[PDB]
Structures are given as C-alpha cells and as structure tokens.
Design an enzyme around this catalytic site. Sequence first.
Site, short mmCIF file in Angstrom:
data_model
loop_
_atom_site.label_atom_id
_atom_site.label_comp_id
_atom_site.label_asym_id
_atom_site.label_seq_id
_atom_site.Cartn_x
_atom_site.Cartn_y
_atom_site.Cartn_z
N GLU A 726 0.85 -1.22 0.00
CA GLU A 726 0.00 0.00 0.00
C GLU A 726 0.88 1.26 0.00
O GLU A 726 0.59 2.19 -0.76
CB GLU A 726 -1.03 -0.07 1.13
CG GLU A 726 -0.46 -0.07 2.55
CD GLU A 726 -0.35 -1.46 3.12
OE1 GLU A 726 -0.49 -2.44 2.35
OE2 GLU A 726 -0.11 -1.58 4.35
N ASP A 727 1.92 1.34 0.82
CA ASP A 727 2.78 2.52 0.82
C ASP A 727 4.23 2.22 0.47
O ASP A 727 5.02 3.16 0.35
CB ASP A 727 2.71 3.23 2.18
CG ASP A 727 1.31 3.68 2.54
OD1 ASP A 727 0.91 4.78 2.09
OD2 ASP A 727 0.60 2.94 3.25
N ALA A 728 4.60 0.95 0.28
CA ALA A 728 5.98 0.62 -0.05
C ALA A 728 6.32 1.05 -1.47
O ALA A 728 5.64 0.68 -2.43
CB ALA A 728 6.21 -0.89 0.11
N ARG A 899 -6.78 7.12 -1.40
CA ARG A 899 -6.45 8.48 -1.01
C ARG A 899 -7.25 9.53 -1.78
O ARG A 899 -7.43 10.64 -1.27
CB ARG A 899 -4.95 8.74 -1.20
CG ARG A 899 -4.10 8.41 0.02
CD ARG A 899 -3.78 6.93 0.09
NE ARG A 899 -2.95 6.60 1.24
CZ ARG A 899 -2.33 5.44 1.41
NH1 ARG A 899 -2.44 4.49 0.49
NH2 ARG A 899 -1.59 5.22 2.49
#
Lengths: 1095, 49, 67, 47
Positions: A726-728, A899
């Site tokens: 998801e954020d890597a 987001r």
Amino acid sequence: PIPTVEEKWRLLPAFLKVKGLVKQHIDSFNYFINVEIKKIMKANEKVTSDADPMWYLKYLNIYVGLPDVEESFNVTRPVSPHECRLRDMTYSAPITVDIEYTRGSQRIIRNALPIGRMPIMLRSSNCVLTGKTPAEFAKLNECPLDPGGYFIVKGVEKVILIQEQLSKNRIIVEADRKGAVGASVTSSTHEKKSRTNMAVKQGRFYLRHNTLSEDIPIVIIFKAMGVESDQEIVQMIGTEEHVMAAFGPSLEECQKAQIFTQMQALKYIGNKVRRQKTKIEEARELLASTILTHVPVKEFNFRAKCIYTAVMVRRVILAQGDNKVDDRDYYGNKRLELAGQLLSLLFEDLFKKFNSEMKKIADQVIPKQRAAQFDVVKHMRQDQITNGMVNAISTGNWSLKRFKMDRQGVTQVLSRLSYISALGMMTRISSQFEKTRKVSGPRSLQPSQWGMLCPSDTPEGEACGLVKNLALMTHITTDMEDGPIVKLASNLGVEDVNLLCGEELSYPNVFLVFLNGNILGVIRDHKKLVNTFRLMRRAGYINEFVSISTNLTDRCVYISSDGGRLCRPYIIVKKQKPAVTNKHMEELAQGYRNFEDFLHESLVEYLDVNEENDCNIALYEHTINKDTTHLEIEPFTLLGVCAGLIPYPHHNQSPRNTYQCAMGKQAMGTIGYNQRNRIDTLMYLLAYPQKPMVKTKTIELIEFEKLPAGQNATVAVMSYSGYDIEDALVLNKASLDRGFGRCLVYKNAKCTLKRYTNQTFDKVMGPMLDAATRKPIWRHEILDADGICSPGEKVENKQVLVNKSMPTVQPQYKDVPITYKGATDSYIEKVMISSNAEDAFLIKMLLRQTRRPEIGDKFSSRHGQKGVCGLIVPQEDMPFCDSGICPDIIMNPHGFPSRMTVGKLIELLAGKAGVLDGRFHYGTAFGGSKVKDVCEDLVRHGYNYLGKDYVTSGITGEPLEAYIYFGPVYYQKLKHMVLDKMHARARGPRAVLTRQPTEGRSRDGGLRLGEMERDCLIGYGASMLLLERLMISSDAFEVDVCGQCGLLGYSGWCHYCKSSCHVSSLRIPYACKLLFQELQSMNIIPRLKLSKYNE
Amino acid sequence: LILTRLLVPPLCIRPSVVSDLKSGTNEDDLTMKLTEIIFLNDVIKKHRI
Amino acid sequence: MIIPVRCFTCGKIVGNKWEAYLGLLQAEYTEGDALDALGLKRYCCRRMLLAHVDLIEKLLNYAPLEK
Amino acid sequence: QQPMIYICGECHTENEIKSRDPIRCRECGYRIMYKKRTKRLVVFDAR
Ligand SMILES: [Zn+2]
Ligand SMILES: [Zn+2]
Ligand SMILES: [Zn+2]
C-alpha cells in the site's frame, strides 16, 4: 461580459512589503518599547518613604539603547547576534533612565542611571540587523532570508506563541444543565478581574459573585443602587406584557422582605456579604467599583450601572423562552495576544517589585543612621531585573502574583529543521484550552473564520484544532484611544443616557450605542449614523482600525476599537463597479500610488470579523451584484504558508492536504545561507536540492525556490514484482549510486568548564604515550597534543573526545573524559574554543555523518503520500519505454483511489510538459493552468497527449500490454531513518530503586510490556510464557519467609519468633518485595500464610 | 492507633543520589524527614530541664 | 550545491555544460533553444540543468578570506 | 614543544596560546579562535 481587471494580484506583494507575514511580531515590540514602556513609567513615577516626608524619588524619562555587552572592565562594544549564538550569551541591551533623588537637604538629578537590561528582537529597530544590505548581512554571518522574530537567551532561539483568549467587558448568555445563565467578565487597566453571573431558577433571578456568600435578588441590588420607586425598576427592565409577567415573582419577593429604603437594602447587603467601617460602608464600597470595574462612577452615581444591569436583565429575559444562545466559538469576539502584552505585564510587575523593594531597604537605615547623607545609588542592584527577564523567557512559566496568574508552555524552541518549519513556527497560534477529549466545537472548523486561519494547516494527532496558523493576508490591530471617537459621536447627535428615562429604551426605533463594552447613549436613525461614521473613516480623520457594526435582534450598534482584532484589506465596490481601475494599477506598476496612497484615496479598507457580518462580499467580478459592498482581492490567499506548497489544493482532498501540511515541516533540506557557521544540536542537510517544476505563486512570494527541500525524479506509476504494498515504494540502485537523495547529519558536542570558590581549577591531560612506540594509545587516539580532537578526522564507537579531569574534593583528580556514543563512525568538522559570560572555557565540536537512502526510509510525494522503501532495484531492471529512460521511483496505482488524489496526475502531466518545453508552469490554488491548453502543447513535440507511453518490459524482454504513466515528480526525503529507529537490549544498566531496565534507547534500555498485550496472552491460555517474560527475565529474587508468623527474615533465621525450624524460601519479583517493605511504614504489616502445594 | 514508636525502614529502600556537576550528594527525602524529626525530639527534652 | 557530473537516471555527463548554459542565457537565447543547442535531446538529462540552484556561490561570501 | 597555532575568525591571524592566559587575539579584539587541520594521512573511499 463584464469589465475585468487582472491586475489586483500585484496588490498583495505591495501590502506584504509594509506589514503582514512576520513583520507584525516586530511591530508589536516596536510599539511596546516606545509607548507601553513610557506608559508604565508614567504609571509609577513618584515613591515616598514613611519615616520622614522629606525624601522622595522622581523619574524624568526612560529609554532603551542598543545591544551591548559588558566585558572584563569598562569596555562596551557592539555585539553581533551570531556572536551571542556561538558563545551561548544572551542578546540584551541596557535600559537608561533619568532618576532624581533628594539626599540630605539638596536635590540630586543623576542622569543616565543604568537599572537593568532587557532582551532585544533580532529584526527590531534598536538592533543592528536593520536597514542593511545583503553584502553587509554576509559580513555579520547572518542569513538575509531569516525572517526573525525570536529571542536569543543562553544561545537558543525562543519564540513566543500567539495565544487566543475570550474578550473582556462584554455580556455572555449561555445555557447549562438547569437553563439559561448570563455572565459578565470585567478587567480594567488596574489589577482587578471580576466575573459576575445572573442565574434564573423557578422564575427568580439571582446574582452571584466571588466575594458574595449567598445569592441576592436583583431587585434588592436595584433598590440599593439608588432607584427607590419600584415602578422605575420595571420601566427600565422592559415595557411589555410578557416581560412584566416574568418579573412578578421578583417584585413580590422584594415586597415580602422588609426592604423599602436604600439604608435597609445596604444593611441587607452588608449582612449577606462576608469579607475577611460598618456594614453600610462596606456594602456601599462593594457596589461602587468592585463587581463591575469597567463602568466608572463619577462621585457616587449608580445610574450607568443601573442602565447596564437593566440591559442585562432584558437580555436574559429575551434569551429565556427562546432558542437563541451565545456561543464562545465565534471568532469575532475572541481576541489574540502577542508577546507584547505579556512583556508589558512582566515589566510592570518587575518595576513595581523593584520600587517596593528599595522602599523597604531604606526605611530602617534613616532612624538608625550614622551619617547625614544617604545615597540611593550605592544601595541599588541591576541583577534582579535581568535575571527575572532571562528566567521568564527561558523557562516560559509566566507567574505573576500581582495579577494572580500562572501560565506554562508559552515560549518554545525555534525549530530549525527546515526553512518552512522555521517560518511556520512564527505563524503558529495555540489556544488556552487544555487537552480535553470532551470538547469538539472549538476543535471543529468554524464558519466564522474565512481567510484568517488556514483550515488545512493543523497538526494530526491529539491536537486536532487547538493549534491553528494565520493566513497570508492578516493584520492584528494595535491599541488606540477613544477621545476623538466619542467626540465625533457626541457631535453626530448622540443623546446622553442621563436625560432619557427607562421607558424610552424599550421603544423599537430607539437604538443604543456600545463602545468597547460601554453604553455610550441613545441614538435615532442608526443607518445614517453608520454611513457617516464609515465616510469619516474612509476620509482619514479617524484611524482606519475602527470597527462598527449593528445588531437588529438586539437593536444596538457596536463600536470596537480595542487592540488585538483581526482584519484583512478588501476592495470597495461602487454600486455596480470596483473603484480600482486599470489606471490606478498602472501607477502601482510604475512605482507610485502604493498601498498607503490607496488607503488615503478611499480605494480599499479593512474589515473585522463582526464588521463583515453586516455586508455582502463577492468572490469574483462576474459574481458582483447590486448588494455586494466589498470585493475579494485574491481567492488563493485563504490557504496558509504550509498549504501553499501543495500543487492543485482544490484537486486534492482535505485529509491529504492536512497530511502534506504536517509533513512539509518534517522534510529536510537547506536551512539558510550560513549553515556551516551556525552550530546547533541537530541539523540536517541535503546534497543537491533541485527546483520544483510546477511552482506556486506563494512559493515565489516567500522565495522558496532559493532554498528547496526536495528533488525532481522520474516516476512511473505501475505495479512491480512484489514490493508495491500500500505505501511501499521501490528505488533505483543506479540512481542511488549516482547520488539521488544523499543526506548529511550534523551533531553538536559542547563542553563547558569553569573555576570554583576556592583555588581549585580544572585541567586537561591530553595524549597518552606508551613505552613501546611514540604513538598515542587506542583510548586517546583522536586526541591532539593540546587535549582536544583535531578537525578532519574520523571518530569510531567508544572514543574519547575531550579529556576532562575534575577535582574530587595536591588534590586528587577524577578523570571524566567525554565518550562519543554512536553506531556508525562520525567525522569531525571543526572545533571552536571561546569564553562565556561567566569567564568559563567553552569548547564546541561539530560532528558530520553522510548517509545514503536504504531499505527502511520514509519518503513523501508532497501530496500527502508517505511511504517506506521497498527493495533496491538494479539497473538491469526498470524497463525503458522508447528512449532509454529508466523509472527512478516506481509508484503504486492501488493507493490512488483510496487516497482520492487527482492533483498528483495533473502535477506529473504539467511537470512533464514543462521539462519538455522549458518553462515552469503555475499551479496555484483556484486557478493556474488547465488540462486543455497543456494537452495540446504535449503533441507538438511528438509524445502522446495525456500521459501514455509504450513500455517494453526488461525482466522478460517483451512489450507491455497496458501503458504506463511516466513523468517527473517533486519528491522529498523526511526524517526517522531506519538507522536511528533501531535498538536492542539484552543485559545492561538497571535502576537502584527498583531492579528493572531503564527508560529510553540512549541509556541502553528495554521495552515495556503493559496490560494491552497481557490480556492477549491471557486470552490464549498460556501461563508459563507470561511468567517467563514478566518474572524470570524482568526481576527474579529469592526471599525467605516463616510459616508460623509471615515476615521477612535473613539467612533462614527469624527475629520475631526466634526459631529456625519454621522457615522456607520462595521466588518473588523484586517489585513485590519492594511494595511489601514499603507498605510497612503505613502502620500495615502484611502477614503471609504459607500452604503446602504438594499436599 | 497512636504513634509512640517510629519504625525506621531499611536503608536499602531509600537509595541516595549523587550529581557530578558540583560534587553534590542528595539523600532520600525520607531520610531528611527522619533526621528532621530527631532534631525536633531533643529540643522538647532540653526545654524541660 | 553544484551541478551533478552525471545524470541520475541514465548517467550522461551533464556537468560539463553548466558554464556553457550560463554563457548561453545572456546571448538572447530561449531556455528550450539553449538546452537543445547544448546537446540535450530528451528530458532524462535536461532537468539537471534547467531546474538547478547555485548555492555554493552564496556560500563563498561567508567563506574565510585571507588578509 | 611546538606552539599550538590558532587562527581567528575576524582577521585570521596565526597566533599561539602559551599557558592559562586570557584567550583572545593580539591583532583584533575578537574573543573566539579556531583550530587548524591535522597533518596526518586520512583514508577515503570513492565508492
Ligand atoms: Zn517466624
Ligand atoms: Zn540523463
Ligand atoms: Zn583575530
């Protein structure tokens, strides 16, 4: 079509040139050391003794000079701010006063008497750093881009946060668990604050105050004030059938009690009130200037007080029975407090303390005297004032017993992490409300604030609205007078309150005038009144910072002129059209007709929060109607300083906006023009800062393009092998080797050493040589011959920096050499040796460490998207599309819908178009560039029109089916690296009170295991593991206990029963035995009962 | 229920601290209060005689 | 601080044209025209010279000087 | 041994501190001094 003027965007720079962003913090101090310093001087000027009325003191004039320092002896030289910042000194200037004292028989006037020192701002009028040139700014080793506004006390930068409070001298009508209640808070120029409240219960009004014991009916207070006839009371209250039916119980209660004369009323008040001189006199003085101090009395006339109380009763009557209440979240009433008023109170208290102290030291020396002349200069000290000011600024705990107030956490260390965090600290505003979870209104976004406080700018966490920041266009009104205002009001035709009676105020056509919470009088035709007042204000006779509004629900005009109000300039419209034309802006572009000339020609004007309530404002020029009164200059001014770095804020979502505003002050970058000269505790630098392609007008307004904190990199939004979680986000090995994202850390190590009261001193050993070779020992390897390390070397773990030997009591010295603690090996930059203000040696060392981005670092996209590093991808991977361009950082397309950030794609598109064309594209809020003229420009070169490119995979060697989104994006590197957020402990130091690991990672401590995880271990059903890691590896102790009488023995021997037979041993954690031995002092004996576990 | 004999706790329950800035030793507040109570006990005996 | 010697993405030497780029911006030339006449073709090694700040020159005014 | 050479921050004069004397400069009136660079051999990696 309507005539539009696209030139009002240059008014904002002209307005910011004179005041605005950070200059008001300096104007609050420059007006303070020119007016309030003299105000407190004329407040306390004459002091006299009590022994004999012949000695007295007088003050002629007081002023403050230039920043000076007193060295060894009789040498006053101008000091530099960087000099005090490097020597850990304090930036202060002496205060020169002209005193007059009568000693013996004649009078002496000693001019230029120093009484103390006082800190000076960095960019003040009295300081040296003012009106200089960048060439001269570089000669003093000071950054010209430094906005300033902080205090330098003991070599640290302290900023005083602006604090908001509620307005005084006003009536509030709130609702509580019982019903409606009215309150009035009063605070005059002298030290007396009061808070009275009128409460309603079972249709009976009561008055409560801090000095009063029990509640007293309001009609009793009315009869005591001076109005005798009960008819005039109801006449003043209200001439209506429903207000008279609600005042019946009060009338019959006043008739029940035997109170019909003023003397009986005062006797009842004296009997009721308790104070720890007869009862009538104290009751009379309690009603004169005690409960309401903001209403002056000429000799003994309570007429104005009666009128004010009657208006309050009418307000609480009209409030009760309806659904109208007054809320405290309204910002039209909430006032702001800068560092000026706090310093004013502090200086006033210190001056009064100094005047009362010397008055007490010279009263018992005149009777018991041995000479004929007594000089007051010899019996005088100038250390108390300076010490008090320095301590109040450093500690930040404002404690004023004369005012009876205590405040903590007002001054804070100026964060020098980046250039945005330093400027954003000056715009931070904290509230007086504590950390309360129950309150949600004040934290919630209020409709009142519009263009005064940035909505997006707010910290994420516990404080979710208590901390707010100012807008770009914002001005705080200073203090002024009311003489000319009341004179013009009386000349307009306002009637005095002493002429008309109580029945006239109830008339609808009649209107009351309020001025700073004071009833000025009665006026008719309030519309012409307001019109003439606004015309006179636009003329130039009255000052521009005077607010005037009207309330039809309350039927009264409010005139606000106190200092501390919010106002922003607005363009005036003339019935269909703005007064500002093209010929007026052409002159501004030429160089004449500035903001001052525009304000003097009746072109623009300031409006308050409550003043704009009674007017219509148009956003654009095509929306201007016949009812609009003022026009917005620019709509992108609503955003804050930290919110002006987000490309297309309207495209992005408010949570992402807040996240990016919070992370903008966290990103590391260039601090200023002199970063190698300044030596701060922790400092972060970048290697090669790039320039943002899609910049904002706010960026140019603050000149952020000269000190950027980020870099441009090629981003390809597509999935990768397995590390696009998801954020890597993944990195490019070749780019990281080329130097994309190289950072440097700088740490400070300071060592001070001084003398003592005896002849005991210190000394440094230096290098230690062995008998084998003429080389230093491994311990003192970096040590030079003098005794300090040499710059330009490398220090590893467990290495002595400077040798410090301190006397234990010819005297035996103990060696305490400072040792460098670190995982990696740092490097030495420079060494500074100086003397402090106490004649002490100070040695400062700056240690640098260059780091590279690795797996476990936090990166941001300047769009509210933070992510940790994935895997380092080599150059054989990262497939090119057509030319041979490899993606520098691969982005994941799965986090975009969650987001909901569309501004990122437009940012990428505009950046690509700009880097292809060769010109920076503007991306300001509520404007900038569209997606239609940029999409047609990307075709002329030869690329696809929106974002698509043909990519051929490099891992397999085949073309990709779907197309990839390629483009340059502005990224930034943040703090909290993996190297620092990594620690482990197995067997280290423990505490002596309780045998347990210490807190903190710098002291080699462990982690805490609370009940949050213990409940999870209990839910599983495992008990051996719970006792293994709460008793076996935490604290294990053997204790001997006796079975007959449970007590703590020793070596298997009891001292109470005197028997060795009954004895056993157990394993008890040290905490349990600690509590057992600590509870014995409370007259409590814990007697245990040992049972056979086997049987 | 009336305090007549004061119970002195062990010394290992009240550790002392030392600061290496001006050679300053600071005992536990418990020890300071105990040694202050002893100074208040003999002034009554001496005042008697 | 200083213009990078090589590019970050591809690795083309773009540190040998900063002085030429500076001298080309004063001879009545366009940013894109000068960048295309220098030798840059794509936007891979073109953003290193276009968007680049020069802080070492401002850092030399604070540098120690001999007298 | 050899006098410890020190440089100033206003005039950059190579002076020396003898022993327990007032730490200042003999040319200007600046009260802060700096240190010289070491004359040893340091190893650096160009990777
Ligand atoms: Zn026993
Ligand atoms: Zn390239
Ligand atoms: Zn010098």
